[PDB]
Amino acid sequence: NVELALTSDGRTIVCYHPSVDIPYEHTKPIPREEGPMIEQLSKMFFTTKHRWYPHGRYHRCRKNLNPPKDR
Amino acid sequence: MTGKELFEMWKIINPMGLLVEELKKRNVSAPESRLTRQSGGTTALPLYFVGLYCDKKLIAEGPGETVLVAEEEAARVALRKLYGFTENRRPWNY
Amino acid sequence: SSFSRAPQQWATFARIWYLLDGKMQPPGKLAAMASIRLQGLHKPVYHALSDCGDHVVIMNTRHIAFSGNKWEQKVYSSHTGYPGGFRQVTAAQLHLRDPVAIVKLAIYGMLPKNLHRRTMMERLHLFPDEYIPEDILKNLVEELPQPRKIPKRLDEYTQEEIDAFPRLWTPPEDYRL
Amino acid sequence: FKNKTVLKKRCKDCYLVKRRGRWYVYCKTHPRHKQRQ
Amino acid sequence: FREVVETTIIEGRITATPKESPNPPNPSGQCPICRWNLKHKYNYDDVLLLSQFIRPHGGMLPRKITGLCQEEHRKIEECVKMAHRAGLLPNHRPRQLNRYLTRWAPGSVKPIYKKGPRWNRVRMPVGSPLLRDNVCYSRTPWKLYH
Amino acid sequence: GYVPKTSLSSPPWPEVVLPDPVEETRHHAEVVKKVNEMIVTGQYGRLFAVVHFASRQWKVTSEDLILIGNELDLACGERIRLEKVLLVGADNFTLLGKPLLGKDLVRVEATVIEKTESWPRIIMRFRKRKNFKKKRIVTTPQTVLRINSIEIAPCL
RNA sequence: CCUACUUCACAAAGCGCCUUCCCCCGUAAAUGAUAUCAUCUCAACUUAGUAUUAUACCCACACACCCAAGAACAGGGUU
Numbered sequence: 177n178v179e180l181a182l183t184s185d186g187r188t189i190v191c192y193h194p195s196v197d198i199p200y201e202h203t204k205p206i207p208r209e210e211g212p213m214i215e216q217l218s219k220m221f222f223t224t225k226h227r228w229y230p231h232g233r234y235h236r237c238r239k240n241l242n243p244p245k246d247r
Numbered sequence: 248m249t250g251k252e253l254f255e256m257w258k259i260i261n262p263m264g265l266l267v268e269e270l271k272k273r274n275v276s277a278p279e280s281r282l283t284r285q286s287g288g289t290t291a292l293p294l295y296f297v298g299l300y301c302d303k304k305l306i307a308e309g310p311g312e313t314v315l316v317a318e319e320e321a322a323r324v325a326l327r328k329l330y331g332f333t334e335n336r337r338p339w340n341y
Numbered sequence: 342s343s344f345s346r347a348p349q350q351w352a353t354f355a356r357i358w359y360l361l362d363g364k365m366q367p368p369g370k371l372a373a374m375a376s377i378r379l380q381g382l383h384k385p386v387y388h389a390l391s392d393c394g395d396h397v398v399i400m401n402t403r404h405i406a407f408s409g410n411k412w413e414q415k416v417y418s419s420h421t422g423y424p425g426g427f428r429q430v431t432a433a434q435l436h437l438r439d440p441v442a443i444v445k446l447a448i449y450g451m452l453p454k455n456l457h458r459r460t461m462m463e464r465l466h467l468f469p470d471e472y473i474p475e476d477i478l479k480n481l482v483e484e485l486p487q488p489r490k491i492p493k494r495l496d497e498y499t500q501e502e503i504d505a506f507p508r509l510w511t512p513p514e515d516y517r518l
Numbered sequence: 519f520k521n522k523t524v525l526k527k528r529c530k531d532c533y534l535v536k537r538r539g540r541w542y543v544y545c546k547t548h549p550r551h552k553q554r555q
Numbered sequence: 556f557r558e559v560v561e562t563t564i565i566e567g568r569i570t571a572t573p574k575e576s577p578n579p580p581n582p583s584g585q586c587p588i589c590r591w592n593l594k595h596k597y598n599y600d601d602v603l604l605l606s607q608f609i610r611p612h613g614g615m616l617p618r619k620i621t622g623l624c625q626e627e628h629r630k631i632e633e634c635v636k637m638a639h640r641a642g643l644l645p646n647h648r649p650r651q652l653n654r655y656l657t658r659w660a661p662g663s664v665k666p667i668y669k670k671g672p673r674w675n676r677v678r679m680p681v682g683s684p685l686l687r688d689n690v691c692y693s694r695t696p697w698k699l700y701h
Numbered sequence: 702g703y704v705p706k707t708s709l710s711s712p713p714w715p716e717v718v719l720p721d722p723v724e725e726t727r728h729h730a731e732v733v734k735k736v737n738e739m740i741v742t743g744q745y746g747r748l749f750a751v752v753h754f755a756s757r758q759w760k761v762t763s764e765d766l767i768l769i770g771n772e773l774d775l776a777c778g779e780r781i782r783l784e785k786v787l788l789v790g791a792d793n794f795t796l797l798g799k800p801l802l803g804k805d806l807v808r809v810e811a812t813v814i815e816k817t818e819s820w821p822r823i824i825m826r827f828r829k830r831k832n833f834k835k836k837r838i839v840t841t842p843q844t845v846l847r848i849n850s851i852e853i854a855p856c857l
Numbered sequence: 858c859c860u861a862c863u864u865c866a867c868a869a870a871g872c873g874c875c876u877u878c879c880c881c882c883g884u885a886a887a888u889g890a891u892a893u894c895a896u897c898u899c900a901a902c903u904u905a906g907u908a909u910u911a912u913a914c915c916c917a918c919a920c921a922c923c924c925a926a927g928a929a930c931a932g933g934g935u936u
């Protein structure tokens with residue numbers, strides 16, 4: 177849904193792209209132990225087990241607790 | 248206030264109620280909250296887009312993890328659009 | 342736009358559920374589509390460390406189609422690790438045993454060979470037939486077009502199309518046929 | 519069957535047939551003529 | 556087309572026979588393929604074209620009867636084999652793994668237990684080399700071996 | 702020349718027909734006029750611009766910060782016009798140069814906010830078993846610019 | 858596995874006893890075209906023709922002492 181148009185001199189391309197709204201008809205009304213724990217978490221979040229095991233103090237201390245923040 | 252968000256600066260409670268009040272001031276009926284898009288509804292990481300419709304016309308839609316959160320965020324987006332404090336509004340002139 | 346920071350981030354990095362129909366499709370083309378989606382290489386916000394993969398639900402994997410004689414020639418090799426544990430099984434035998442293994446292995450081979458591969462395979466959902474569990478069906482968001490367009494059979498062609506196609510030759514009348 | 523690099527019909531009833539991927543010379547009269555590529 | 560009917564007494568009756576469609580695009584050609592400008596523009600899945608040279612039970616028709624070139628008769632025969640093996644002619648039968656582009660009869664190929672090294676890989680044939688000269692609509696040539 | 706409808710009779714991609722030049726020019730003029738009227742009436746919020754500065758292209762908007770990896774021979778706080786604007790876009794329209802937009806269309810202005818050195822960068826060379834080890838520390842001059850405003854004019 | 862025999866003796870053993878269950882494919886055929894016969898078919902098709910190992914086994918989330926359980930740990934029992 178974009179309108180392309182060179183200008184008369186042909187030196188600049190003009191693109192008209194209005195934002196199209198979602199039609200009302202295209203919408204639905206609003207409705208009104210360590211082992212087993214890690215298996216449950218992996219099933220819940222569609223991950224593997226390895227993510228949920230802890231890490232040693234060395235890794236934990238290596239993690240930066242005051243990371244730079246942008247925007 | 249550059250880079251700040253409207254409701255990051257102005258803390259509000261019940262944005263849906265506040266939006267309903269504003270629409271009443273504008274003599275407009277209460278918007279219909281309606282589920283425009285959704286993803287993974289039965290999982291632990293759902294995505295919902297809820298749009299507020301004024302007479303079958305979309306005024307603002309917002310995303311969220313639950314339908315309630317998406318509706319609340321859509322209310323916030325509608326308030327931003329009504330007040331002209333949208334993210335892509337004309338930047339301040341200096 | 343004009344979302345709050347947290348909802349905006351959630352929307353951008355939310356994972357979508359795609360549906361592939363494996364009926365009469367090459368497992369390799371299915372695997373290319375699925376591997377792209379599982380990695381997240383279909384998102385402009387993709388990055389290997391962003392965990393931006395999506396869910397892929399492939400149905401009718403029992404009805405995949407191999408081109409050529411791959412059903413008889415393609416051999417899947419495995420070793421149990423024990424001496425004499427080397428097993429070589431053709432594609433047809435593997436399909437009869439597990440109606441999911443062929444697509445699963447194609448996708449597994451196409452995914453990058455790193456530690457994210459099995460996490461990606463956790464987001465892959467393979468179903469031999471048209472049946473899909475209700476929660477997965479409710480999760481479904483989009484259906485991807487089938488990579489191979491299924492050719493029509495004569496039994497499927499309409500009489501109008503048959504008439505539209507010209508007769509190519511005059512058969513001699515005095516022929517048994 | 520005898521394995522032959524080159525298949526040669528021996529009598530008139532020796533016929534070449536490509537079966538199970540390879541060429542054979544079969545013969546009803548003289549099964550001694552049976553050849554396999 | 557003559558058909559033999561029994562009752563014992565048997566007799567052959569000539570029935571309705573289709574004729575070539577009017578206005579061939581290229582009249583005065585060797586083969587029907589040349590007459591209709593289809594030299595390199597049909598594939599195994601073009602059942603409408605292929606079935607016109609097929610016995611009611613699936614067999615090919617002889618080159619003398621069809622009038623096809625030698626090369627075109629070979630191409631049609633191989634394309635019909637591929638269409639049959641892909642199941643595109645369910646009604647042209649004498650009386651479950653989906654396939655297509657199968658060069659060999661399924662029961663005659665042996666599994667590739669030892670695919671060679673990279674420089675001597677044993678590849679799985681796909682399609683037919685007879686169609687190598689078909690019209691190429693792709694940047695890369697279509698591969699006959701996988 | 703007619704070929705019966707087969708799989709290979711026609712190219713797989715859909716056939717494309719060039720629109721008639723008269724209607725193409727009419728539609729082009731209509732779209733250009735609509736966007737020009739939007740510019741006249743100020744029917745746009747934030748503007749972004751792709752600008753070629755130094756050697757690179759920067760996606761830029763008002764209040765943005767840009768780090769040039771060289772000194773610019775400008776005093777801090779000095780205002781500047783970035784003259785090579787390749788693209789300017791709004792919510793509802795974009796203007797594309799071929800390759801550059803005109804000076805009459807867009808005006809992107811920046812301000813030299815900082816003149817600094819980069820953090821020390823290490824260049825080490827090492828070759829095993831050759832007694833070959835060299836170390837150098839380099840700091841690159843840098844200028845931080847702030848994009849103050851992007852202005853467009855109805856000169857389409 | 859220990860009822861006998863034997864080495865032996867509150868048990869461990871053999872020299873003693875008990876139990877052990879499905880196939881793989883080379884070919885041989887049927888109909889049948891290309892090539893109106895024929896032709897087992899890297900033609901379509903129909904059989905011998907089977908691995909898609911069938912099973913079987915295991916499955917209880919949460920001191921001390923004894924043990925046919927055992928290096929430790931673990932396991933079983935303590936009504």
Ligand SMILES: [Zn+2]
Pocket residue numbers: 528529530531532544545546547548551
């Ligand atoms: Zn003989």
Ligand SMILES: [Zn+2]
Pocket residue numbers: 584585586587588589624
């Ligand atoms: Zn010809």
